Design a binder for this molecule. Structure first.
Ligand code: CD
Ligand code: CD
Length: 43
């Protein structure tokens, strides 16, 4: 019973665009604003 998620929080959309990610959930302010697919969970 230890650890499940990653350890560097930041959605896909912030990767590509090079954006800041307050990390609001599910989608940051970013994706919500542009209707995007905020996925901060790779594979
Ligand atoms: Cd983000
Ligand atoms: Cd996002």
């Amino acid at each position: 019973m230890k650890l499940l998620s990653s350890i560097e929080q930041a959605c896909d959309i912030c990767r590509l665009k090079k954006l800041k990610c307050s990390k609001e959930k599910p989608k940051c302010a970013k994706c919500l604003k542009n209707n995007w697919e905020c996925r901060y969970s790779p594979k």
